[PDB]
Structures are given as structure tokens and as C-alpha cells.
Design an enzyme around this catalytic site. Sequence first.
Site, PDB file in Angstrom:
ATOM      1  CG  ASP A  76      -0.212  -0.230   2.533  1.00 27.10           C
ATOM      2  OD1 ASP A  76       1.024  -0.165   2.656  1.00 27.10           O
ATOM      3  OD2 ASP A  76      -0.938  -0.526   3.511  1.00 27.10           O
ATOM      4  CB  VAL A  81       0.296  -3.151   5.269  1.00 27.35           C
ATOM      5  CG1 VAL A  81       1.123  -4.464   5.136  1.00 27.35           C
ATOM      6  CG2 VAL A  81      -1.144  -3.546   5.451  1.00 27.35           C
ATOM      7  CG  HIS A  84       2.164  -9.725   3.478  1.00 29.48           C
ATOM      8  ND1 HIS A  84       1.381  -8.782   2.801  1.00 29.48           N
ATOM      9  CD2 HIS A  84       2.955 -10.243   2.521  1.00 29.48           C
ATOM     10  CE1 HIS A  84       1.586  -8.900   1.511  1.00 29.48           C
ATOM     11  NE2 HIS A  84       2.504  -9.815   1.295  1.00 29.48           N
ATOM     12  CG  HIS A  97       6.424 -11.322   0.338  1.00 25.51           C
ATOM     13  ND1 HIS A  97       5.180 -11.635  -0.230  1.00 25.51           N
ATOM     14  CD2 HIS A  97       7.262 -12.276  -0.122  1.00 25.51           C
ATOM     15  CE1 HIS A  97       5.295 -12.838  -0.813  1.00 25.51           C
ATOM     16  NE2 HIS A  97       6.539 -13.207  -0.781  1.00 25.51           N
ATOM     17  CG  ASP A  99       5.372  -1.454   1.700  1.00 31.50           C
ATOM     18  OD1 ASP A  99       5.935  -1.064   0.668  1.00 31.50           O
ATOM     19  OD2 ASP A  99       4.181  -1.151   1.957  1.00 31.50           O
ATOM     20  CG  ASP A 100      12.546  -1.395  -0.257  1.00 31.15           C
ATOM     21  OD1 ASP A 100      12.843  -0.552   0.598  1.00 31.15           O
ATOM     22  OD2 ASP A 100      13.398  -2.170  -0.734  1.00 31.15           O
ATOM     23  CG  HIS A 119       5.452  -9.085  14.642  1.00 34.62           C
ATOM     24  ND1 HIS A 119       4.632  -9.022  15.723  1.00 34.62           N
ATOM     25  CD2 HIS A 119       4.600  -9.134  13.609  1.00 34.62           C
ATOM     26  CE1 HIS A 119       3.348  -9.179  15.422  1.00 34.62           C
ATOM     27  NE2 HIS A 119       3.271  -9.240  14.057  1.00 34.62           N
ATOM     28  CD  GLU A 120       5.661  -9.665   9.273  1.00 34.29           C
ATOM     29  OE1 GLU A 120       5.253 -10.518   8.497  1.00 34.29           O
ATOM     30  OE2 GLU A 120       4.837  -8.892   9.783  1.00 34.29           O
ATOM     31  CG  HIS A 123       2.883 -13.562  11.837  1.00 28.81           C
ATOM     32  ND1 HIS A 123       1.855 -13.876  12.705  1.00 28.81           N
ATOM     33  CD2 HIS A 123       2.877 -12.218  11.691  1.00 28.81           C
ATOM     34  CE1 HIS A 123       1.328 -12.758  13.156  1.00 28.81           C
ATOM     35  NE2 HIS A 123       1.923 -11.717  12.526  1.00 28.81           N
ATOM     36  CG  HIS A 129      -1.428 -10.423  15.665  1.00 25.76           C
ATOM     37  ND1 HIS A 129      -2.108  -9.829  14.631  1.00 25.76           N
ATOM     38  CD2 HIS A 129      -0.120 -10.349  15.291  1.00 25.76           C
ATOM     39  CE1 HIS A 129      -1.268  -9.324  13.770  1.00 25.76           C
ATOM     40  NE2 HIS A 129      -0.064  -9.727  14.059  1.00 25.76           N
TER      41      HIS A 129
HETATM   42  C1  LIG Z   1      -2.669 -19.002   7.190  1.00 28.59           C
HETATM   43  N1  LIG Z   1      -2.960 -17.543   7.177  1.00 28.59           N
HETATM   44  C2  LIG Z   1      -1.838 -16.724   6.817  1.00 28.59           C
HETATM   45  O1  LIG Z   1      -0.749 -17.191   6.550  1.00 28.59           O
HETATM   46  C3  LIG Z   1      -2.040 -15.264   6.680  1.00 28.59           C
HETATM   47  C4  LIG Z   1      -2.400 -14.933   5.213  1.00 28.59           C
HETATM   48  C5  LIG Z   1      -2.685 -13.470   5.016  1.00 28.59           C
HETATM   49  C6  LIG Z   1      -1.697 -12.662   4.506  1.00 28.59           C
HETATM   50  F1  LIG Z   1      -0.447 -13.136   4.243  1.00 28.59           F
HETATM   51  C7  LIG Z   1      -1.946 -11.331   4.331  1.00 28.59           C
HETATM   52  F2  LIG Z   1      -0.999 -10.473   3.833  1.00 28.59           F
HETATM   53  C8  LIG Z   1      -3.176 -10.821   4.626  1.00 28.59           C
HETATM   54  F3  LIG Z   1      -3.451  -9.505   4.379  1.00 28.59           F
HETATM   55  C9  LIG Z   1      -4.165 -11.629   5.103  1.00 28.59           C
HETATM   56  F4  LIG Z   1      -5.431 -11.103   5.319  1.00 28.59           F
HETATM   57  C10 LIG Z   1      -3.926 -12.979   5.264  1.00 28.59           C
HETATM   58  F5  LIG Z   1      -4.989 -13.759   5.665  1.00 28.59           F
HETATM   59  N2  LIG Z   1      -0.758 -14.674   6.991  1.00 28.59           N
HETATM   60  C11 LIG Z   1      -0.693 -13.516   7.820  1.00 28.59           C
HETATM   61  O2  LIG Z   1      -1.800 -12.959   8.414  1.00 28.59           O
HETATM   62  N3  LIG Z   1       0.499 -12.905   7.926  1.00 28.59           N
HETATM   63  C12 LIG Z   1       0.795 -11.662   8.630  1.00 28.59           C
HETATM   64  N4  LIG Z   1       1.988 -11.167   8.472  1.00 28.59           N
HETATM   65  N5  LIG Z   1       2.146 -10.045   9.290  1.00 28.59           N
HETATM   66  C13 LIG Z   1       1.064  -9.732  10.020  1.00 28.59           C
HETATM   67  S1  LIG Z   1       1.073  -8.284  11.106  1.00 28.59           S
HETATM   68  S2  LIG Z   1      -0.203 -10.822   9.735  1.00 28.59           S
HETATM   69 CA   LIG Z   2      12.551   1.927   1.392  1.00 25.50          CA
HETATM   70 CA   LIG Z   3       3.024   0.309   3.521  1.00 29.76          CA
HETATM   71 ZN   LIG Z   4       3.436 -10.528  -0.516  1.00 31.91          ZN
HETATM   72 ZN   LIG Z   5       1.583  -9.651  12.993  1.00 37.51          ZN
END
Ligand SMILES: CNC(=O)[C@H](Cc1c(F)c(F)c(F)c(F)c1F)NC(=O)Nc1nnc(S)s1
Ligand SMILES: [Ca+2]
Ligand SMILES: [Ca+2]
Ligand SMILES: [Zn+2]
Ligand SMILES: [Zn+2]
EC number: 3.4.24.17
Length: 165
Positions: A76, A81, A84, A97, A99-100, A119-120, A123, A129
Site C-alpha cells: 500500500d 501495512v 507480511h 515480504h 514493503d520497500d 515479529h514476522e 508468523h 497475534h
Molecule cells: C494461514 N494464514 C496466513 O498465513 C495469513 C495470510 C494473510 C496474509 F499473508 C496477508 F498479507 C493478509 F493480508 C491476510 F489477510 C492474510 F490472511 N498470513 C498472515 O496474516 N500474515 C501476517 N503477516 N504479518 C502480520 S502483522 S499478519
Molecule cells: Ca525503502
Molecule cells: Ca506500507
Molecule cells: Zn506478498
Molecule cells: Zn503480525
Amino acid sequence: FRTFPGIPKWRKTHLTYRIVNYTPDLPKDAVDSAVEKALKVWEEVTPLTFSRLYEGEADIMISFAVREHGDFYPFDGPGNVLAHAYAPGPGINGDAHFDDDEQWTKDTTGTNLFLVAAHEIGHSLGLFHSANTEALMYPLYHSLTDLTRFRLSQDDINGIQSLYG
Ligand SMILES: CNC(=O)[C@H](Cc1c(F)c(F)c(F)c(F)c1F)NC(=O)Nc1nnc(S)s1
Ligand SMILES: [Ca+2]
Ligand SMILES: [Ca+2]
Ligand SMILES: [Zn+2]
Ligand SMILES: [Zn+2]
Ligand SMILES: [Ca+2]
Ligand SMILES: [Zn+2]
């Protein structure tokens, strides 16, 4: 602590990672070290081990990108954001990934790469969370964590031991 629905998790103990490309924001060295330090946080409290690859497909692929980049969730631009990651499994699963369009720093004031990466990976290993304000997994961790005193909370530790032992 919370996990993802159906409790996905890694089915082997020895995982690999690859840093695909680099941000313009910091030097290469500074990036390698933020990432290695993030992985060590989790290696200390689980029986998993990580090793790096420079070619081929690794379990966790790390990359920098802007707006649309090959998945269902486009970046975005500046703010909102920041990154992710996907839950454990094959292909895109486990990948992270960044966001650059954000400004990646090594500072305690601003968007810190080491903090967001720790944190990532949480996940990527299977944790969702938390509701505990002191946790690395609480949603506002990026604004609330004092990097001079960094430490995983008991809640973080409880959560990861329930999956990995
Ligand atoms: C099995 N479910 C997942 O793996 C989800 C899949 C997924 C996305 F990856 C995503 F970008 C998104 F916008 C979603 F709405 C979504 F559902 N992964 C996460 O929520 N990753 C996160 N990374 N950092 C956070 S702060 S939350
Ligand atoms: Ca940058
Ligand atoms: Ca952003
Ligand atoms: Zn991505
Ligand atoms: Zn998170
Ligand atoms: Ca993967
Ligand atoms: Zn094996």
C-alpha cells in the site's frame, strides 16, 4: 498467545532461508545482521536450526517489494501495512515480504528492520497475534518495544513451546 486455525507447523527441525534481494535504505551488511539476529531469537527457545542458501528454493524466502508483487496481497505505499508472512507449509508458505516504500532503519526511533523481522518470523513459525501487551506478537509491538531492553515475553515462549516442545 494464539496460533493460526488448524494449527499449521513445520514437519522437520532443520530449515533453510535465502535473502533474495536488498533494500536501498541500508547497507547489505546491516541487512544480513538484522535477519540473522531475528532468526537466533527463535532458535534459542526451540529445537529448530536455520541455515542459509544462496541459490535454489529455501523453506523461508525473504524479499523486498512495492505495491503488486506476485500474490493476493499488494503493498500500500508509505505507512499502514509494513510487511507480511505466511504460516508453515510448501511453496509460498513460510515466506516473508517487506514493503520497500517504508524507510528501513537500524534506529530506535523509526521503522526498525530487526524488530519487524523478529515479529514476522513468529508468523512464519506458526504464531498469530497475542492479547498480552508485553508480547513480541501483540499487534502494536513496533511502537511499544524498547530495543535497549529487548526480550521475548513469557507468553511468546509459552506459545512457541506448545508447537515445537
Ligand atoms: C494461514 N494464514 C496466513 O498465513 C495469513 C495470510 C494473510 C496474509 F499473508 C496477508 F498479507 C493478509 F493480508 C491476510 F489477510 C492474510 F490472511 N498470513 C498472515 O496474516 N500474515 C501476517 N503477516 N504479518 C502480520 S502483522 S499478519
Ligand atoms: Ca525503502
Ligand atoms: Ca506500507
Ligand atoms: Zn506478498
Ligand atoms: Zn503480525
Ligand atoms: Ca516457502
Ligand atoms: Zn531431515
